[PDB]
Amino acid sequence: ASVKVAVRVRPFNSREMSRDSKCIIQMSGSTTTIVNPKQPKETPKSFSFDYSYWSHTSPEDINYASQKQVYRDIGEEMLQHAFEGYNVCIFAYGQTGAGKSYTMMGKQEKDQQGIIPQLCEDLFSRINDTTNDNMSYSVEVSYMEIYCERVRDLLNPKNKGNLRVREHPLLGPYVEDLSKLAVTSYNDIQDLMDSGNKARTVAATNMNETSSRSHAVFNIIFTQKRHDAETNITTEKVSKISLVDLAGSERADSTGAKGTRLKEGANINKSLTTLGKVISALAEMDSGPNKNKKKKKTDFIPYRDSVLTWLLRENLGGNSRTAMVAALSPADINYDETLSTLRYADRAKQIRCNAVINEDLNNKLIRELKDEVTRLRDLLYAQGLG
Amino acid sequence: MREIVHIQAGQCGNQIGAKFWEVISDEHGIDPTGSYHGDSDLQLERINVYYNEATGNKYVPRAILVDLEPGTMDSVRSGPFGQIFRPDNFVFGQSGAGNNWAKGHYTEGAELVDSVLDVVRKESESCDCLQGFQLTHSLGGGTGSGMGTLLISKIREEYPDRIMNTFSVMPSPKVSDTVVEPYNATLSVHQLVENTDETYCIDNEALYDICFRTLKLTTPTYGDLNHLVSATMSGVTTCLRFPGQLNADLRKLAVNMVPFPRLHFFMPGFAPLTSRGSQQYRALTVPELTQQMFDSKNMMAACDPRHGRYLTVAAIFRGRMSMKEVDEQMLNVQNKNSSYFVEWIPNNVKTAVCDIPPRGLKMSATFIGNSTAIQELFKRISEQFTAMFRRKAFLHWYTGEGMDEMEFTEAESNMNDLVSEYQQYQDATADE
Amino acid sequence: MRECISIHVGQAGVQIGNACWELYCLEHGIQPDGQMPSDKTIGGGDDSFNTFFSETGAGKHVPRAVFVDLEPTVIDEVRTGTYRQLFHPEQLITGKEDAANNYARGHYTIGKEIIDLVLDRIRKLADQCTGLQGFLVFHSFGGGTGSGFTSLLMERLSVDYGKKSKLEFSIYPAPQVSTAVVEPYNSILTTHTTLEHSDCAFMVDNEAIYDICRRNLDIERPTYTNLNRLISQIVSSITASLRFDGALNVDLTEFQTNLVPYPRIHFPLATYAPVISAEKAYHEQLSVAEITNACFEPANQMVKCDPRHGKYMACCLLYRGDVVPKDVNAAIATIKTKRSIQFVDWCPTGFKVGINYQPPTVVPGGDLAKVQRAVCMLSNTTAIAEAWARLDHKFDLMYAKRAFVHWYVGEGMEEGEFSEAREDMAALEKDYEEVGVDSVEGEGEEEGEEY
Amino acid sequence: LLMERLSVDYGKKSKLEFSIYPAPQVSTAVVEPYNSILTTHTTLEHSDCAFMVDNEAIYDICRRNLDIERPTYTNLNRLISQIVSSITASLRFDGALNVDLTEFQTNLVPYPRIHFPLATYAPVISAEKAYHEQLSVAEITNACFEPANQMVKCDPRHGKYMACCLLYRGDVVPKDVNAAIATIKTKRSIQFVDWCPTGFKVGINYQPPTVVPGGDLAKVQRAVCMLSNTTAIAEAWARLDHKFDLMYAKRAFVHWYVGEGMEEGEFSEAREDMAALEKDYEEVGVDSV
Numbered sequence A: 001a002s003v004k005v006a007v008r009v010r011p012f013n014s015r016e017m018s019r020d021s022k023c024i025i026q027m028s029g030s031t032t033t034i035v036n037p038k039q040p041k042e043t044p045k046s047f048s049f050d051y052s053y054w055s056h057t058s059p060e061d062i063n064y065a066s067q068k069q070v071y072r073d074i075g076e077e078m079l080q081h082a083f084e085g086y087n088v089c090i091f092a093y094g095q096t097g098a099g100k101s102y103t104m105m106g107k108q109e110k111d112q113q114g115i116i117p118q119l120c121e122d123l124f125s126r127i128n129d130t131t132n133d134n135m136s137y138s139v140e141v142s143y144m145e146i147y148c149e150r151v152r153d154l155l156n157p158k159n160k161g162n163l164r165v166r167e168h169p170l171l172g173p174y175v176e177d178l179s180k181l182a183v184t185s186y187n188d189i190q191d192l193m194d195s196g197n198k199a200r201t202v203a204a205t206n207m208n209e210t211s212s213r214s215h216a217v218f219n220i221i222f223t224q225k226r227h228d229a230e231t232n233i234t235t236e237k238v239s240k241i242s243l244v245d246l247a248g249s250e251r252a253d254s255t256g257a258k259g260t261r262l263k264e265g266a267n268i269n270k271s272l273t274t275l276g277k278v279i280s281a282l283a284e285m286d287s288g289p290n291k292n293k294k295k296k297k298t299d300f301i302p303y304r305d306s307v308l309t310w311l312l313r314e315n316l317g318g319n320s321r322t323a324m325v326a327a328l329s330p331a332d333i334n335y336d337e338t339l340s341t342l343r344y345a346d347r348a349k350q351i352r353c354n355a356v357i358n359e360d361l362n363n364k365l366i367r368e369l370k371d372e373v374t375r376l377r378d379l380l381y382a383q384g385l386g
Numbered sequence B: 001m002r003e004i005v006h007i008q009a010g011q012c013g014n015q016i017g018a019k020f021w022e023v024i025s026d027e028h029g030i031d032p033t034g035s036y037h038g039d040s041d042l043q044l045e046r047i048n049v050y051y052n053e054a055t056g057n058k059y060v061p062r063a064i065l066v067d068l069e070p071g072t073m074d075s076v077r078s079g080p081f082g083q084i085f086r087p088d089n090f091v092f093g094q095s096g097a098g099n100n101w102a103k104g105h106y107t108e109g110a111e112l113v114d115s116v117l118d119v120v121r122k123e124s125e126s127c128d129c130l131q132g133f134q135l136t137h138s139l140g141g142g143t144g145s146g147m148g149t150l151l152i153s154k155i156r157e158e159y160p161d162r163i164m165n166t167f168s169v170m171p172s173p174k175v176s177d178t179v180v181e182p183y184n185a186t187l188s189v190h191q192l193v194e195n196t197d198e199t200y201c202i203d204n205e206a207l208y209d210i211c212f213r214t215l216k217l218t219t220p221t222y223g224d225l226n227h228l229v230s231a232t233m234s235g236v237t238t239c240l241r242f243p244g245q246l247n248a249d250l251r252k253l254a255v256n257m258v259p260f261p262r263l264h265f266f267m268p269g270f271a272p273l274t275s276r277g278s279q280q281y282r283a284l285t286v287p288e289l290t291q292q293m294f295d296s297k298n299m300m301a302a303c304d305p306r307h308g309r310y311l312t313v314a315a316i317f318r319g320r321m322s323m324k325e326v327d328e329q330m331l332n333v334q335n336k337n338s339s340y341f342v343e344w345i346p347n348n349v350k351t352a353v354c355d356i357p358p359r360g361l362k363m364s365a366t367f368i369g370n371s372t373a374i375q376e377l378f379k380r381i382s383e384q385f386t387a388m389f390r391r392k393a394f395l396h397w398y399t400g401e402g403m404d405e406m407e408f409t410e411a412e413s414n415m416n417d418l419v420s421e422y423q424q425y426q427d428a429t430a431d432e
Numbered sequence C: 001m002r003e004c005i006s007i008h009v010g011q012a013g014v015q016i017g018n019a020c021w022e023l024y025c026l027e028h029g030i031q032p033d034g035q036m037p038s039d040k041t042i043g044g045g046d047d048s049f050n051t052f053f054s055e056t057g058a059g060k061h062v063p064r065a066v067f068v069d070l071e072p073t074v075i076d077e078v079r080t081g082t083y084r085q086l087f088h089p090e091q092l093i094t095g096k097e098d099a100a101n102n103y104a105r106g107h108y109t110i111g112k113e114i115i116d117l118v119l120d121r122i123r124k125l126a127d128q129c130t131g132l133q134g135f136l137v138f139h140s141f142g143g144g145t146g147s148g149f150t151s152l153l154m155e156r157l158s159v160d161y162g163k164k165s166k167l168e169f170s171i172y173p174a175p176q177v178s179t180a181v182v183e184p185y186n187s188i189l190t191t192h193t194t195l196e197h198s199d200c201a202f203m204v205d206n207e208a209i210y211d212i213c214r215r216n217l218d219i220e221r222p223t224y225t226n227l228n229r230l231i232s233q234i235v236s237s238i239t240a241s242l243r244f245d246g247a248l249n250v251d252l253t254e255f256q257t258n259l260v261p262y263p264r265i266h267f268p269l270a271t272y273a274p275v276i277s278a279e280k281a282y283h284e285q286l287s288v289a290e291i292t293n294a295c296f297e298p299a300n301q302m303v304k305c306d307p308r309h310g311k312y313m314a315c316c317l318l319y320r321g322d323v324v325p326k327d328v329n330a331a332i333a334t335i336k337t338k339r340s341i342q343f344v345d346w347c348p349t350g351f352k353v354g355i356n357y358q359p360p361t362v363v364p365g366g367d368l369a370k371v372q373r374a375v376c377m378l379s380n381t382t383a384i385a386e387a388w389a390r391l392d393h394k395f396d397l398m399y400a401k402r403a404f405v406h407w408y409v410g411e412g413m414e415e416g417e418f419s420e421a422r423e424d425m426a427a428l429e430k431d432y433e434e435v436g437v438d439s440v441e442g443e444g445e446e447e448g449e450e451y
Numbered sequence D: 001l002l003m004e005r006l007s008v009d010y011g012k013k014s015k016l017e018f019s020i021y022p023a024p025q026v027s028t029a030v031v032e033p034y035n036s037i038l039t040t041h042t043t044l045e046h047s048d049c050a051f052m053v054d055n056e057a058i059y060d061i062c063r064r065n066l067d068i069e070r071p072t073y074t075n076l077n078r079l080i081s082q083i084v085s086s087i088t089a090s091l092r093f094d095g096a097l098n099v100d101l102t103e104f105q106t107n108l109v110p111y112p113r114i115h116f117p118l119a120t121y122a123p124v125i126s127a128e129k130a131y132h133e134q135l136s137v138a139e140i141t142n143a144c145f146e147p148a149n150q151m152v153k154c155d156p157r158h159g160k161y162m163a164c165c166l167l168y169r170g171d172v173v174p175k176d177v178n179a180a181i182a183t184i185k186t187k188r189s190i191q192f193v194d195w196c197p198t199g200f201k202v203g204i205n206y207q208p209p210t211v212v213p214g215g216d217l218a219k220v221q222r223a224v225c226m227l228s229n230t231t232a233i234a235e236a237w238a239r240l241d242h243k244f245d246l247m248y249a250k251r252a253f254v255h256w257y258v259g260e261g262m263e264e265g266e267f268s269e270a271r272e273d274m275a276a277l278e279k280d281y282e283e284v285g286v287d288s289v
C-alpha cells in the first residue's frame, strides 16, 4: 500500500498580484513543471505525481479542478478503502498561505466545501442508505490540535489544561482524556466541526490574513456491526479516518513575525523539519530496501523527536493507507519553497505501508477454524472419503 | 549577566551540593559567614552568577534545598557551611519516599512540589537575566529521583526558553546499594530524556576506580567523590565567571554538543589527577593534560569510550596557555584516534580557554564527551528491569501509590528507542 | 520525629522488652529512675530522642511501651524491679487466670474485657506521638496470650490504624526442643493473623540461639537472659538508623520496600555477625569482610534452617561503627562470586546496604565483647518453608486423633478454624515453593526477525 | 544585520571587511561550516572588499619566521593590526605615491562579485634574524609571492594572479620597486591572467612601520604589504563547502537553528549561492581564445 501523492496549484492573492504577477507552474496530465525565473535558460524541471490539480482559473472549464472534482478523485476512494476497513489518513503539506486549510476545510458558507465536510456528507449518506435490520453503523468523532508541542482538545468546552500523550503497548501512541463525542446526524457533526474550527488558534501575518498557528487532526472512528444472532457478531469491523491539517513553513523576514508570533513560527518550523526528516526516511528506507532487494537492518526513524510525528506513527507507516496533498503557491517569489515542497512530495511517493483490515482474531480465529472444518468436510464428503 | 539557579534533591544531591558550594566559596574567597575576604579583584567581578548580595556586604548562595527527610537538612546545617544558606530555602517534609519512585513523584512529592516551585519562582524573578537551572541528585534513589523529575517537568513547563542541566548519579554493574535501583533508574531516565537539555552521567564505580588507581587513595569516602563531582561542576561553568581568550557559555556547549534533541547524555572528566607524592615527577603541560583527558580510565561514567564512537566532545581549559598548542593537540587526538570519531562531523571537538586557573593549580581542564558507548549503561539497566518486570518482582509497592503496568511499559519502550538511537551511529561505513 | 511504639505481649515478650529497654537506656544515657544526668552535665542535646522515649517538663523520660500479659506475676516483677520508676504506672495486667496455652481462651474468652483498655493506651500514645513510624510487636508462638491476644490486637490495630508499618518479632517452636504439648495448635492457629495483618515478621528459634551461645560465646549453660539480650541487640541494630546519623540511613518503609517482593512472603530471617566473647575478641581482625562472610554462614543463622537448601530472594545489611563503603562493596562482590550462595534470577541486585556511625554498646554484666564494627543482616529466603513444613507435620500427628481439642472448642472455636488454618498454611507453603522457582526457562521462541 | 542596514542607509561609502576564515584542519567549534556558508550572502552582496585570514597560516608564519614555538592570539592580532595599518597608512602620512581607498578598490576588483583578495606581509622576521639579511626591496618583493608566507591556506601556484597591489612603507625608491616588479614578471611560476597586461599597482609611503613595545617583530627600515586578487581562493572555499555537505546530509545540528525563526531551506539557498561564486572564480580564469 504505497502512499498516494496529490498536488494542487492555487490562484493568485492580493500580495502576489500587487507585486509581480507571473506564474511559474505548468501542469499537464500527471506531470507538474516548475521553472526558475532567475534561470530561464535552464531546463524546465518536471516531477511526476499521481494526481495534479490546476485550480488557477475558477470559472473556466479548461482542466479546472473544483473541490467536487478533488473530493471525488481522492476522498472518494479513500472513503471506500475505509469502507473495507483499512485505517485511512489524509495529510496536507506545503508552505504558508498555499491553501492547505482551503483544500481540507474550505469555506463552509459556499458550495466549495473542503475534503472533511464532503467526506462527512458521503459517509452519512452511505450509512443512511445502507442501513438494514442486521447491518448497522456507529460513528464517533474527535478533533485535536498541537499548538506548541502541546495537545489541546477543540470539541471540548474551555479546558486550559493540556492533554497527556501515552503509548498503549499494542495500539501505539494515543492521547489520554480526549473528549471524544458521538454523532447521530450530519448537522450534529457539522456543529462539532464548527466549534472545533472556532476553537483553533489563528493569527494574522503578512503572508496570510488567517494563518494556522497549530497543527490539527480530525479523527473519525467508524464501526460496522452485524445484528445477526444466528452467525454474525457486533462491532464486526472498525476503521479510523485521520484528516490532518498541518501549519506551513515560515520565513521570519517575509512573515514579519515578532515576539510570540516568531516563537510560534519557530516551533512550527521545528515540527515541520522533524516531519520532513521522517518523510525522507520512510521514503529513503523503502528506497534503499527495494533498490537492491533485502538484508534486514530497518534502522530507526526519529518518531519521538516531535509530538506530531509521534502521534502519527501508525499513519506515516505500518497499519494505514495514507494520502499526501500538497499546496503550491504559483508566484515566482515562493519558487524555492515550492521546489522544496515538491521535492519532499516526491519522497512521499516512495513510502510503503503494511495495511491490515483488523477484524477480531478472538472471533475470527473461531470463524476461520469453522470455515476450515466446513471446507475439509465438504472435500471429504464430495470425494467419498468421509 | 547570566546567572544560574541551583537546586539540590535527595541525600546524594544534598551532599554533592554542599561540597560544590564549599568549592565555589573557596574559589570566590567567600568566608563561611558570608563575608568576602579574597585577594584578586576578578572574584567579585561575576559573583552574582552564583550568589545574591545581602544588606551587610554578605553573599548568600542561590541554592534551593529539597528533601523529604529532615535528617539530611540537619546534617547540612550542622556543617562547616551550614550558615551560608538562606534558612527560608530549606524546603522539606517528613516520611520520605523510602526508595519508592511512586511516592517521590505522585504521593508525597506532589505536596511539597508547590512550596519548592514557589521558592524557585521567587528566586528566579529576582534575577536580572536568568540563564538556566542545574539539579543534583541520584536516579537510583527514592525522593531524589522522583521529586527531581517532577521539578524538572514543572520548571520546563514554566521556563521553556532557559537551558536545563542535570548532574545525575546512576546505578552501577557491581556497586549496588538498593534493591529497586532498575525501576527508579528506568522511570528517571524516561523523565530525563523527555524534559532536559543537558545531563551529565556520574557513576560511583568509575569514581571509586579513579580514587583507587589514579589518586591512590587507600580509604576513599563519599567526600572524595563529591570533591571530584564539584571539580567537574566548577569546570563546566568556569567560563561564565572569569574572562578568557575564547569564551564558552552553557548555551554554546549545548548547541555544539547536541546533534539531535534526544542525544543529550554526557560523560564528564577532569584533569590533572596526580595522587600526591608524584607531582614532582610529572611535568605539567597541555600535552599531559590532553593525554590524561582522553584516557579511558579517567571517565566518571564507567563506560569504555573505545567500545563506540565519539559523537562530539568539548574541552574547557583553565590557565595561561597557547592556542596553537591546544588546537594542535586536539588535531593530533582526532588524527591518531581516527576510528573513534564519527566521519560525518568533521572536527567534532569543541575548545574553550579561560585565563583564571584554580587556586592551587597552574593549569587545569575539564572534558565533556558525547559517545555511543553510553548505550551500555542504558542496556544494562534495561536488562535488570526486565529481570524484575517479567515476574513483577517488587511491583505492588508502586501500584499501591497510583501507577500501572502501562507506565512501566512505555518507560522501557522509550529507553529501547533511546538505545537504538545511540546504536545507529556506532558501526562504520556510510555515505559519500 | 521518627517515633515508634513497642508493644510486648506474653511472658516472652515482657522479658524481651525488659532486656531491650535496658539496652536503650544504656545507649541513650538514661538512668533507671528515668532522669538524664547527661544533659545536666553537658547542658542540652537531642540524646533524649523521641524515637523510644517521651520527655516531660520535669526532665523525666518515659518509654513509648505497652506491656500486656494475663499473668500478674511476670510484670509484678517489673513493678517491684529496678525499672519501676521508668514506666508509666499503668501496666495493663488482667488480675485473672492465664490463657493456659489455649489460643481460644486468649482470643475469645479472656482476651475480651482487656483489649479495650489496651487499645485505649495504644491511642493515648499514638495521639501523643506525631509522625508515627510504626509498631514493634513482641510475642511468642505456642503461648496462649502470646498467640490469641496478639492476634486480636493486630486485627484491631489493622482496623483502626491500617497504613502504619507493623513489624513483628516472635519466637517460633524449635524442631526438637519444646516446653509445652499444644505448641503446634497455637502456632498453626495464629498463622492466619500473622500472614494477613503483619507487614514483616522477624522470627527466631531458641535452639539456634542456644547453639550460637554455646559455640561462639563459649557459654556452656545459657539462660533466657542471654537470648533476650541477643534479640535486643538485633532490634537495636534495626532501629539505630532512625536515631543516629549515618552515611546511609534506612527507615522502616525502606525495609518494607526492599525485603518484601510480594505481600505474602514477608517472613525474613535475621542474624548478627560479631557474636564473640571477650577472650576470643583478640586474635581477630573483625574487618568488614569477616563479618559480612560470617553473616551468611549456615551455623550463625538464628533459625534452625539451612539457606543452602533454598535461594535468597532479598538481603539487607545494616552496618554500625567504623565502616566505609569500599569494604562493604568489596564484601558484597566477594559474596556474589561464591557458588554456595544462590540468588533468584529475577532479583539481579539482591542487596540493600545501610551504614551508621554509632557503634554497638556493651551491657554491664553481659557477655558480648566490645567491638569497633558490627552488622545485622535480614534475609528473605525460601529456606524458611522447611521449618514450617516440620511444624505442619507435628500438627497432623496431633490432629488425626483430635487430641487436646476439647479444651479449645470449649472456649469458642470449632474444627473449621483448625482446618482453615491448616489450609492457609499449606497455601503459604505452596506460594513459597512457587516463588522460589526460577524464571520461565528463557522464553527463547527463536522468532526469526519479523514474525 | 549591520552590513545590510549600513548598505541601506549609506550605500555609496566603501565597506572593507577583515575576517578570519575557517581553517582547513583546526577549529574551535563543530558548527563553523553552517555559519560560514550562511555568511556568504553578507560577504558577497553588501561588502565592497572582503579580506580573509587563516589562523593556521599565521601560526606557521609565526613558527617559521618569528621562531615563536607557542604563539597565541595576541601575535595573530598584532600581525592583523600591522596589515590594516599598512593598508591605511596612505590616508595619514605623506608619500611619493599615495593610494586612496577609492583607487585602492578600483584596481583590485575587476568585477563586482570577485572582491575577495588575499593579503601578505613581507618583513615578518625576529630580532635575531633581523641581522644577517639585507631586507632590500627585491628581497621583500620576492618574499611576498612565496606560498610559505601567504596568510591563507591556499597555494597561489594552483591558480592565476588576477590583480596585485603593493603598498610600501619606509625608505623605498620607485626604481627598486620597478626593478622588483620586472623581476617578478620575468619569473614563470607566477602566472597572470592574459586580460590584465598591467597587473601591478604601486604605492609608497615615507612613514616606516612602528614596533609595539613587548612585541616580536623587529625594527625594519622598509616594509611592504601585498594585496592580491587571485583565483586560488576558490579552493579555500571548496574545502569548507565539502564539510557543509557532510554535515547537511543528515540534518545534524539543524534543530538549534530552526528553533530560532530560521527556515530549513535557507541552508540550501546559501549552498547554491556559494556554489555560484565558485563557478564564477572558475569561469573568470579560462583564458580567452
Ligand SMILES: CC(=O)O[C@H]1C(=O)[C@@]2(C)[C@H]([C@H](OC(=O)c3ccccc3)[C@]3(O)C[C@H](OC(=O)[C@H](O)[C@@H](NC(=O)c4ccccc4)c4ccccc4)C(C)=C1C3(C)C)[C@]1(OC(C)=O)CO[C@@H]1C[C@@H]2O
Pocket (backbone or CB within 6 Å): B022, B023, B024, B026, B027, B215, B224, B225, B227, B228, B230, B231, B234, B235, B272, B273, B274, B275, B276, B279, B358, B359, B360, B361, B364
Ligand atoms: C602539591 C599541590 O599542589 O597540592 C595539590 C595536590 O597535591 C593534588 C594532588 C590535588 C589534591 O586533591 C586531592 O587530594 C583530591 C582528593 C580527592 C578528590 C579530589 C582531589 C589537593 O587536595 C587539592 C588542591 O586543589 C585545589 O586547591 C584546587 O583549587 C581545587 N580545590 C578544591 O577542590 C577545594 C578544596 C578545599 C576547599 C575548597 C575547594 C579545585 C579544583 C577545581 C575547581 C575548583 C577547585 C591542591 C592544590 C592540592 C591538594 C591540597 C593536596 C588534586 O586535586 C585538585 C583537583 O586540585 C588531586 O589531583 C589534583 C592535582 C594536585 O597535584
Ligand SMILES: Nc1nc2c(ncn2[C@@H]2O[C@H](COP(=O)(O)OP(=O)(O)OP(=O)(O)O)[C@@H](O)[C@H]2O)c(=O)[nH]1
Pocket (backbone or CB within 6 Å): C009, C010, C011, C012, C013, C015, C016, C071, C098, C099, C100, C101, C102, C106, C139, C140, C141, C142, C143, C144, C145, C146, C171, C178, C179, C180, C206, C224, C225, C227, C228
Ligand atoms: N527467648 C525467650 N523465649 C521465651 C522466654 N520466655 C518464654 N519464652 C518462650 O515462650 C514459649 C512459651 O509460651 P509463652 O509465650 O512464654 O507463654 P506466655 O507468654 O506465658 O502466655 P501463656 O502461655 O498464656 O501464659 C516457650 O516455648 C519459650 O521458648 C524468654 O525469656 N526468652
Ligand SMILES: Nc1ncnc2c1ncn2[C@@H]1O[C@H](COP(=O)(O)OP(=O)(O)NP(=O)(O)O)[C@@H](O)[C@H]1O
Pocket (backbone or CB within 6 Å): A010, A011, A013, A055, A095, A096, A097, A098, A099, A100, A101, A102, A103, A208, A210, A211, A212, A213, A246, A247, A248, A249, A327
Ligand atoms: N483556489 C482558491 N480559490 C480561492 N481562494 C483560495 C484558493 N486557494 C486558497 N485560497 C485562499 O487563500 C487563503 C489561504 O488559504 P489557507 O488554506 O487558509 O492557508 P493555509 O493552508 O491554512 N496555510 P497556513 O497559514 O499555515 O494555515 C484563504 O483565504 C483561502 O480561501
Ligand SMILES: Nc1nc2c(ncn2[C@@H]2O[C@H](COP(=O)(O)OP(=O)(O)O)[C@@H](O)[C@H]2O)c(=O)[nH]1
Pocket (backbone or CB within 6 Å): B009, B010, B011, B012, B013, B015, B016, B097, B099, B138, B140, B141, B142, B143, B144, B145, B169, B176, B177, B178, B204, B222, B223, B225, B226, C247
Ligand atoms: N557520590 C555519592 N553518592 C551518594 C552519596 N550518598 C548517597 N549516594 C548514592 O545515592 C544512592 C542512594 O540514593 P538516595 O540518596 O538515598 O536517594 P534519596 O533517599 O531519594 O535521596 C546510592 O546508590 C549511593 O551510591 C554521597 O555522599 N556521594
Ligand SMILES: [Mg+2]
Pocket (backbone or CB within 6 Å): A100, A101, A102, A211, A212, A245, A246, A247
Ligand atoms: Mg491551514
Ligand SMILES: [Mg+2]
Pocket (backbone or CB within 6 Å): C010, C011, C070, C071, C098, C145
Ligand atoms: Mg503466661
